[PDB]
Design a protein around this ligand. Structure first.
Ligand SMILES: Nc1ncnc2c1ncn2[C@@H]1O[C@H](COP(=O)(O)OP(=O)(O)O)[C@@H](O)[C@H]1O
Ligand SMILES: Nc1ncnc2c1ncn2[C@@H]1O[C@H](COP(=O)(O)OP(=O)(O)O)[C@@H](O)[C@H]1O
Ligand SMILES: [Mg+2]
Ligand SMILES: [Mg+2]
Lengths: 42, 217, 221
C-alpha cells in the first residue's frame, strides 16, 4: 500500500473501521500511517 | 572482477497471511468507493499485487511440500534434477534460456520435497538472471569424495556487496516480484543434508552455484 | 451411553501448493475481472464476495497445514508437553470464547520426542475440532497424564459427537460435516504426525454427548 496517497490511505482507514474489517488489516493501515508519520490524522 | 562466498524470517503462516490480510481488506474496500473508478481500480491492483506476493512465497517455500511429515531417503540426484528442470522448462522458454544438462545418477540422503525445493530455488534464480536470453548449465560430478551439483548461468551476475548478502532474509533486487527468501531456504536445506554451498559470480557475466553433498552408497 | 462408538489405536490428498493455489487463483481471477475494465456495481460486489470466500478457503488450509511451520527444516527435540499445549490453548482462546466454550486444562510437564511445529499443529487441529463441535457452548477438557510408560494427552468436548459411520471416516481426505467451511484435512494431518512420533490415537464419541480424543506418545526421559 506504499503507492496509496496520504489522502486515500486515511480514507481507507476510516472506511475499514466503519465496515469492521479485520483488526489485522486495520493494524496494517495504522502501521503504514505511523511509517508516514501521519498518526496525528487518526 | 569475480567474487565467491562459501557457506530472522517470519513463520510460513505469518509470511503468507500478511499479503492475504491486505488483499482481503482492499477487496472489501472496493465497494466503499462507488463514485471513484480510479480508487476502486487502485484497491483491486493492490489486492492482486498482494495475492501475487502470496504466490511468490508459496513458490519459494511450498512448491513440493505435501501434507505429511517427510522421511529421509536415498535420492537419485539425476532424476530429481530432471524433474525440477521439466518444471522450469516453460520458464526457460519465453526468456530464451538454453538448458544444458550433464548429469550422473549419484545418490545422496535427504527429503525429496525439500531437496527439489532447494534445486528449484537455485535454478529459478539462474533463469531470472537471464531475462532476455542465456545458457543454464547443470553439472553432476564427484568432487573429492562428495557429490557436486553446480548450476551456472550467463546472467546479470552479482557485485561483491550483493553476493555477501545473498541468502539474507528479505534481501532482494527484484522489486515487488522479489521475496529474498528463496536462497535462505536453499542454505537451510543444504545444511540439514550435511552439505556445503559455494557461489561465484561476476557482474554482467553470470553466476555459478556449487552444491556439495555426502555420497550415499 | 448406548450410542458410544470407538476408534481403536491403529487415502490421497493434494500437495499443499495445489490445495492453496486453487482458491488463490480463483480469488485473483475474480479481482482481475474488476481491475481490467469498469464493471457495474452488482458484478463487482458479487466478484469480490466470491474472492473473499476463496480467501477463506486458503486460510482454512493454512490453518490445517501451516499454522506453526517455519521455513527452516525441523529437527526432533525434547518437547515439554505442558508448554506446547499452553501455546495451542492460547491461540484458540478467542475461538472458544466466541462459541461460549470454557477451557479446563489439567497439565503436567511430561516430555516427548518430536518436531515442535508439527506437534503444535497436531494439537491445534484436534482442539479446534473440539471447539467446532460445540457451537453453542460446552466444556473443552485438556488432560495430561502418564499411562504405562506413555504420555497421555486427552482432549474432551461435550459437543455434537459422531455416529459409527462418521467416526469410521474421520481423517479420510476431504471428508467433512462442516459444509462450505470444512476441509476434511485436519485429522488426516494429525494421524500422520502422531504416527511419525511413534504414537497412537484412540477416539471415543457419542452423538449429542461429545468426543474424547486420546493421544499416546512414548515418554521421553
Ligand atoms: N543466479 C543469480 N544471478 C544473479 N543474481 C542472483 C542469482 N541468484 C540470486 N541472486 C540475487 O540474490 C537475491 C536474493 O535471491 P532470493 O533469495 O532467491 O530472492 P528473490 O529471487 O525473490 O529476489 C536476488 O534478488 C538476486 O539479486
Ligand atoms: N471433536 C469432534 N466432535 C465431533 N466431530 C468431529 C470431531 N473431530 C472431528 N470430527 C469429525 O471429523 C470430520 C473431519 O475433521 P477434520 O479432518 O478436522 O476436518 P474439518 O474440521 O475441516 O471438518 C469433521 O468434519 C467432523 O465431522
Ligand atoms: Mg529467488
Ligand atoms: Mg478440523
Amino acid at each position: 500500500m506504499k503507492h496509496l496517497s496520504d489522502e486515500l490511505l486515511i480514507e481507507s482507514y476510516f472506511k475499514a473501521k466503519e465496515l469492521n474489517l479485520s483488526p489485522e488489516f486495520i493494524e496494517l493501515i495504522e502501521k503504514e500511517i505511523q511509517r508516514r508519520s501521519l498518526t496525528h490524522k487518526i | 572482477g569475480p567474487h565467491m562466498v562459501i557457506r530472522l524470517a517470519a513463520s510460513i503462516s505469518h509470511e503468507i497471511r500478511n499479503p492475504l490480510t491486505a488483499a482481503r481488506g482492499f477487496i472489501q474496500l472496493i465497494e466503499e468507493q462507488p463514485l471513484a473508478a480510479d480508487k476502486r481500480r487502485q484497491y483491486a491492483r493492490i489486492a492482486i499485487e498482494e495475492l501475487d506476493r502470496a504466490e511468490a512465497i508459496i513458490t519459494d517455500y511450498l512448491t513440493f511440500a505435501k501434507p505429511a511429515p517427510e522421511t529421509p531417503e536415498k535420492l537419485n540426484v539425476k532424476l530429481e534434477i530432471e524433474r525440477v528442470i521439466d518444471i522450469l522448462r516453460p520458464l526457460a522458454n519465453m526468456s530464451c534460456v538454453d538448458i544444458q544438462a550433464t548429469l550422473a545418477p549419484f545418490s545422496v540422503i535427504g527429503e525429496r520435497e525439500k531437496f527439489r525445493q532447494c534445486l528449484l530455488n537455485v535454478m529459478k534464480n539462474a533463469i531470472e538472471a537471464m531475462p532476455n536470453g542465456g545458457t543454464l548449465q547443470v553439472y553432476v560430478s564427484i568432487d573429492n569424495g562428495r557429490v557436486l551439483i553446480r548450476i551456472a548461468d550467463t546472467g546479470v551476475g552479482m557485485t561483491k556487496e550483493q553476493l555477501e548478502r545473498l541468502g539474507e532474509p528479505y534481501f532482494t533486487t527484484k522489486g515487488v516480484k522479489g521475496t529474498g527468501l528463496g536462497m535462505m531456504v536453499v542454505y537451510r536445506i543444504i545444511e540439514s543434508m550435511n552439505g556445503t554451498i559455494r557461489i561465484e559470480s561476476e557482474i554482467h557475466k553470470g553466476t555459478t552455484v556449487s552444491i556439495y553433498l555426502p555420497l550415499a552408497s
